[PDB]
A paper describes a structure:
Bacterial periplasmic binding proteins (PBP) are receptors for extracellular solutes in metabolite uptake, chemotaxis, and intercellular communication processes. The PBPs collectively constitute a structural protein superfamily characterized by two pseudo-symmetric domains that are linked by a hinge formed by two or three β-strands connecting the domains; a ligand-binding site is situated at the interface between the two domains. We have characterized the stability, determined the ligand-binding properties, and solved the X-ray crystal structures of the apo and ligand-bound forms of a thermophilic periplasmic ribose-binding protein from the hyperthermophile Thermotoga maritima (tmRBP), the mesophilic homolog, ecRBP, of which has been studied in detail.
The apo-protein was crystallized using a construct that consisted of residues 30–310 (numbering according to NCBI NP 228766), containing a M142A mutation to prevent expression of the in-frame ORF. However, superimposition of the tmRBP ribose complex C-terminal domain onto the C-terminal region of the apo protein suggests that these this region does not form interdomain interactions in the absence of ligand. The apo-protein and ribose-complex diffract to 1.4 Å and 2.15 Å resolution and were refined to Rcryst/Rfree values of 18.0/20.3 and 19.3/22.3 respectively. The apo-form of tmRBP was solved by separately searching with the amino- and carboxy-terminal domains of the ribose-bound form of tmRBP. The two molecules found in the tmRBP asymmetric unit differ in the inter-domain closure angle by 10°, analogous to the conformational heterogeneity observed in ecRBP.
Author numbering: 2 to 281
Write the structure that this text describes.
C-alpha cells in the first residue's frame, strides 16, 4: 500500500521532522510513502489532493495549511474513499478526517502554570503580591492561546499572582528581547516572566541579563535544546514543556495502518501529551 504525506511547508525544521518521520514510519510498517509540500499555499495543497486521489493512494497523512481553507480538500478525499489523518494542525469540521492528532498545548499550559505557582510560592511563600509578565505567541495562532489559557486556568486561581504586563513577541527570539527590554523598564516590579515558547524565553533571558535583572525567573514551552541546557545549567530559565512531534507523526501513520487493517473506531480529536521539564 501507499501513503501520501501532505505537509504545509518544508521551510521550517518542525515540519520537516513531521513529514520525514511519517514517511520513515510508513516504510517501517511496510508501506510506500511520498511527501507532498504545499508551500503554505492552499491551492497547491488542493492540487496535491486531486493528484493523490487520481493516483489511488490508500491513506493521507495531512498537515493542513488552513483550518478553514483545507476543509474542502479533506471532503474530496472522503468522497473518494481515502482516509485522512491530520497531524499538528486541524480542520474546523468534523466527520471528514478519521482523526486529527495534535500536541496538547492547553495541557502544557496547565503544567506550566502549576509549576509557576509551585516554584514561585517556594521562593516567595509570604509575599502578598508576586507580579509577573506574559509573552504571548503570534496572536492569530491557536497554540498561543491554548498555552496561555491553560497557564491562566491555574495561575488565575491564586490571587497573589498579578499579571502586570502581557504582550505578543510573535514566538520570536529577537522580538522577545525588545519586548522584554520595554517591560522591564515599565514594570520593574516583576518577579517572573511566563513565555509562550522557548525562543521567546531565550530572548527574555538575554534582555534580563542586559538589564542586570538576573533575579527574574523565566518559564517557557517547547523543549528546545538551548532552553533545556539553560535549565540544566541553573540559568534563570527554570522550566519548559517538552513536546513529542515524532510520536505525533508516527501515531498518524500507525492509525492509518490500523484503519487499512479494518479498524474504524477512532476518536476524531486527539491530543498527544506533553511533559514538564525542570531543574530537579
Amino acid at each position: 500500500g501507499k501513503m501520501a504525506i501532505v505537509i504545509s511547508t518544508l521551510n521550517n525544521p518542525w515540519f520537516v521532522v513531521l513529514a520525514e518521520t511519517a514517511k520513515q514510519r510508513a516504510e517501517q510498517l511496510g508501506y510506500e510513502a511520498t511527501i507532498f509540500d504545499s508551500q503554505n499555499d492552499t491551492a497547491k495543497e488542493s492540487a496535491h489532493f486531486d493528484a493523490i486521489i487520481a493516483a489511488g493512494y490508500d491513506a493521507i497523512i495531512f498537515n493542513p495549511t488552513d483550518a478553514d481553507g483545507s476543509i474542502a480538500n479533506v471532503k474530496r478525499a472522503k468522497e473518494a474513499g481515502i482516509p485522512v489523518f491530520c497531524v499538528d494542525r486541524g480542520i474546523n469540521a468534523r466527520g471528514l478526517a478519521v482523526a486529527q492528532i495534535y500536541s496538547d498545548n492547553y495541557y502544557g499550559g496547565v503544567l506550566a502554570g502549576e509549576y509557576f505557582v509551585k516554584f514561585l510560592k517556594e521562593k516567595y511563600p509570604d509575599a502578598k503580591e508576586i507580579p509577573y509578565a506574559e509573552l504571548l505567541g503570534i496572536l492569530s495562532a491557536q497554540p498561543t492561546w491554548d498555552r496561555s489559557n491553560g497557564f491562566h486556568s491555574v495561575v488565575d486561581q491564586y490571587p497573589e499572582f498579578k499579571m502586570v504586563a502581557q504582550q505578543s513577541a510573535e514566538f520570536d527570539r529577537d522580538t522577545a528581547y525588545k519586548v522584554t527590554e520595554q517591560i522591564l523598564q515599565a514594570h520593574p516590579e516583576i518577579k517572573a516572566i511566563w513565555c509562550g515558547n522557548d525562543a521567546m524565553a531565550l530572548g527574555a533571558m538575554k534582555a534580563c541579563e542586559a538589564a542586570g535583572r538576573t533575579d527574574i525567573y523565566i518559564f517557557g514551552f517547547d523543549g528546545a535544546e538551548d532552553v533545556i541546557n539553560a535549565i540544566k545549567e541553573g540559568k534563570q530559565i527554570v522550566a519548559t514543556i517538552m513536546q513529542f512531534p515524532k510520536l505525533m507523526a508516527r501515531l498518524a501513520v500507525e492509525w492509518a495502518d490500523q484503519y487499512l487493517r479494518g479498524e474504524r473506531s477512532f476518536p476524531e480529536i486527539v491530543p498527544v501529551t506533553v511533559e514538564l521539564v525542570t531543574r530537579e
